[PDB]
Design a protein around this ligand. Structure first.
Ligand SMILES: CC(C)CCC[C@@H](C)[C@H]1CC[C@H]2[C@@H]3CC=C4C[C@@H](O)CC[C@]4(C)[C@H]3CC[C@]12C
Ligand SMILES: CC(C)CCC[C@@H](C)[C@H]1CC[C@H]2[C@@H]3CC=C4C[C@@H](O)CC[C@]4(C)[C@H]3CC[C@]12C
Ligand SMILES: CC(C)CCC[C@@H](C)[C@H]1CC[C@H]2[C@@H]3CC=C4C[C@@H](O)CC[C@]4(C)[C@H]3CC[C@]12C
Ligand SMILES: CCCCCCCC/C=C\CCCCCCCC(=O)OC[C@@H](O)CO
Ligand SMILES: CCCCCCCC/C=C\CCCCCCCC(=O)OC[C@H](O)CO
Ligand SMILES: CCCCCCCC/C=C\CCCCCCCC(=O)OC[C@H](O)CO
Ligand SMILES: CCCCCCCC/C=C\CCCCCCCC(=O)OC[C@H](O)CO
Ligand SMILES: N#Cc1c(N)nc(SCc2ncc[nH]2)c(C#N)c1-c1ccc(O)cc1
Ligand SMILES: CCCCCCCC/C=C\CCCCCCCC(=O)O
Ligand SMILES: CCCCCCCC/C=C\CCCCCCCC(=O)O
Ligand SMILES: CCCCCCCC/C=C\CCCCCCCC(=O)O
Length: 388
């Protein structure tokens, strides 16, 4: 069979290529948020915790991965730490992603209270807590859910390992029920599904809010039509009680538009509760000069912001769908290894490829920002032009 240093040299070189890009891309993210106070929101503190976990993939997890494919003689628990450190960092990224979905959900659903609820100080406390939980979850095998107690000793003597040592291989020290049940199903897959729901709720609340907005608009204008085209005084009253309510509704330079608007409706309602039909129909035309000059322009900045929230949460959902794509192959292969012991194990080369793919996720997030977030892309250019 072919000398394995040939296939390894390829896998290593690829891994190092990827570590290089991971560091750069994600240092630039971080340098970006540091420098551009437009990018200094709570949402982006999570983006930074995400970029830092990806820098750490290049600086550490990927060298660890290179190390543990050699099979080098190593004390079992030390081999377990270099095997598990990547699980810690990946768990950090799930928490950061979930935090971002939730943040964006709070932002669209209770925009009024978002500044007072989601503050820079609570964000940073959540980030710290999640990093501690990621170390706990990711290094749980250290605490005894491992295969250290049953070393492959024929394989350790074949390699001259010291007494106390193992060939340091991932599938030899980390149990596959840990990886399938605990790490995949419960600590990755369940969080992804969750993140998937949150984003459904965001797109629904935006879809609904925009609906309400353009409904209200049409109440405003159809009740005007009812008024031009009545010839009876209690018709006009009925249509202005409705206009009025549909105005204190949409309420919740801006306010002088609704001040005027409800005022003119209070003017015209009052004519109409006197029987002056024509006097009130031409009073309820004064509204139209007020819609044209104020209400249409609140309609429109409010639609603008919702379309911006929607587009932002699609950008962020793409970050989560690419996480899924990069990591799923590897889990899906572990599922086969574990659930079908009748099946031949996936070949070495594919293991290599699933692992490499999982690591490329540490290169995608920076490209996403740059293609999808005008403020990150403008800031990427300033840094790239001024320094290179
Ligand atoms: C601040 C950063 C750079 C610290 C990096 C520390 C890393 C490189 C260290 C910390 C703990 C170390 C491990 C501790 C124990 C063992 C068992 C031994 O039989 C082989 C080496 C091995 C597997 C070590 C490899 C290197 C290691 C993972
Ligand atoms: C998320 C997207 C990209 C889908 C991922 C599909 C990949 C991971 C799937 C599709 C077909 C799968 C293979 C189908 C059959 C076998 C034979 C078995 O003896 C070992 C596992 C192995 C080799 C599977 C490994 C995982 C596999 C390659
Ligand atoms: C949305 C999707 C990607 C969620 C995850 C799907 C996973 C859990 C599913 C998709 C395909 C499934 C595999 C399909 C075929 C086999 C072969 C059988 O002998 C053991 C179960 C096993 C190995 C399944 C395990 C679970 C599996 C890997
Ligand atoms: C080695 C492993 C990882 C490197 C960690 C990188 C840590 C990133 C620090 C940069 C930072 O705080 O910038 C964002 C702030 O400006 C937000 O207000
Ligand atoms: C040594 C092992 C390294 C671990 C990963 C390093 C993680 C360091 C934490 C990064 C998260 C971060 O910086 O979040 C703060 C945010 O910017 C608020 O302003
Ligand atoms: C910035 C910081 C740089 C990041 C750290 C880089 C590499 C860590 C991985 C190195 C682990 C190598 C262990 C090899 C070993 O111990 O091999 C002995 C064995 O007994 C057979 O000789
Ligand atoms: C959520 C998806 C969970 C998918 C769960 C897949 C379970 C597969 C299974 O139970 O496989 C049994 C097999 O017979 C073992 O030998
Ligand atoms: N599974 C799994 C798994 C595995 N069997 N091997 C390795 S490295 C040994 C090796 N390198 C090339 C061929 N074999 C790694 C790593 N890192 C994982 C792994 C596990 C969880 C992750 O979040 C990321 C990666
Ligand atoms: C996905 C990202 C880019 C993929 C690059 C190609 C994958 C890197 C190494 C996979 C092939 C390594 C082994 C080649 C065959 C020889 C062998 O397996 O021993
Ligand atoms: C800095 C980047 C370093 C990258 C990888 C270091 C890999 C160490 C290889 C383990 C030694 C193999 C052995 O002794 O059998
Ligand atoms: C910046 C710090 C760089 C840290 C050192 C990097 C990699 C060390 C490579 C480990 C070599 C193992 C030798 C194995 C052996 O000789 O048997």
């Amino acid at each position: 069979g072919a000398p394995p240093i040939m296939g390894s040299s390829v896998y290593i070189t690829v891994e190092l290529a990827i570590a290089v890009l991971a560091i750069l891309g994600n240092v630039l993210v971080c340098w970006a948020v540091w420098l551009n106070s437009n990018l200094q929101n709570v949402t982006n503190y999570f983006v930074v915790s995400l970029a830092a976990a990806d820098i750490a993939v290049g600086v550490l997890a990927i060298p660890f991965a290179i190390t543990i494919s050699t099979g080098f003689c190593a004390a079992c628990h030390g081999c377990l730490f270099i095997a598990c450190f990547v699980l810690v960092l990946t768990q950090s990224k799930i928490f950061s992603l979930l935090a971002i979905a939730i943040d964006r959900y709070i932002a669209i659903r209770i925009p009024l209270r978002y500044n007072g609820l989601v503050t820079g100080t609570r964000a940073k406390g959540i980030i710290a807590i999640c990093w501690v939980l990621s170390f706990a979850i990711g290094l749980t095998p250290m605490l005894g859910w491992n295969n250290c107690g049953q070393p492959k000793e024929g394989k350790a003597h074949s390699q001259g390992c010291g007494e106390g040592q193992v060939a340091c291989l991932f599938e030899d020290v980390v149990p596959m029920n840990y990886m399938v049940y605990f790490n995949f199903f419960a600590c990755v897959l369940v969080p992804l599904l969750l993140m998937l729901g949150v984003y459904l709720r965001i797109f629904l609340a935006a879809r609904r809010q925009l609906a309400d907005l353009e409904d209200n608009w049409e109440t405003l204008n159809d009740n005007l039509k009812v008024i031009e085209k009545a010839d009876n005084a209690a018709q006009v009253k009925d249509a202005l009680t409705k206009m009025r309510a549909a105005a204190l509704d949409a309420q919740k330079d801006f306010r002088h538009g609704f001040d005027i608007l409800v005022g003119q409706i209070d003017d015209a309602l009052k004519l109409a509760n006197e029987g002056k039909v024509k006097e009130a129909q031409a009073a309820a035309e004064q509204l139209k000069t007020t819609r044209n000059a104020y209400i249409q322009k609140y309609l429109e900045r409010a639609r603008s912001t919702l379309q911006k929230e929607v587009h932002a949460a699609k950008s962020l959902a793409i970050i989560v769908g690419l996480f899924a794509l990069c990591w799923l192959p590897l889990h899906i292969i572990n599922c086969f290894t574990f659930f079908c012991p009748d099946c031949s194990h996936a070949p070495l080369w594919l293991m290599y490829l699933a692992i490499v793919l999982s690591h490329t996720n540490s290169v995608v997030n920076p490209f996403i920002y740059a293609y999808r977030i005008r403020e990150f892309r403008q800031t990427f250019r300033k840094i790239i032009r001024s320094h290179v």
